[PDB]
Amino acid sequence: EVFNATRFASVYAWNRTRISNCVADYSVLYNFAPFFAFKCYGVSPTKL
Amino acid sequence: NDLCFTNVYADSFVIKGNEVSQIAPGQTGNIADYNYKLPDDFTGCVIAW
Ligand SMILES: *[C@@H]1O[C@H](CO)[C@@H](O[C@@H]2O[C@H](CO)[C@@H](O)[C@H](O)[C@@H]2O)[C@H](O)[C@H]1NC(C)=O
Numbered sequence A: 001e002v003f004n005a006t007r008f009a010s011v012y013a014w015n016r017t018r019i020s021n022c023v024a025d026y027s028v029l030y031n032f033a034p035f036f037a038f039k040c041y042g043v044s045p046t047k048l
Numbered sequence B: 001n002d003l004c005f006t007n008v009y010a011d012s013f014v015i016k017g018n019e020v021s022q023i024a025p026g027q028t029g030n031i032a033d034y035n036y037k038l039p040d041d042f043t044g045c046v047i048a049w
């Protein structure tokens, strides 16, 4: 529900959503976007 | 050309433009994790044209 939206807000008003009380399996995050840059700093996708 | 290599391995594979950026020592993606993963201590280079 965060990746397939239609009106990702502009950078001047960056909409923020809170993710909690669920189980995260980022394979859906992987397959829902043709990734161009997954530059992470404090964490890594292989074990996310 | 100032180097003496014991053995040279020459793998070739045709692949997309962004997966050219994907292939690197220790990367991730649909290809870097399920098709061709390079070693983290990779002593060698890749060529793309
Ligand atoms: C940021 O984007 C979220 C997308 O999941 C919005 O959440 C939705 O908000 C609508 C109301 O606008 C709810 O009806 C819906 O159930 C869901 O919670 C979120 O509102 C949005 N935030 C801002 C500030 O635009």
Ligand SMILES: *[C@@H]1O[C@H](CO)[C@@H](O)[C@H](O)[C@H]1NC(C)=O
Pocket (backbone or CB within 6 Å): A004, A005, A006
């Ligand atoms: C939800 O994701 C699907 C798959 O990408 C997409 O076709 C659909 O338009 C998305 N929903 C909305 C409301 O955009």
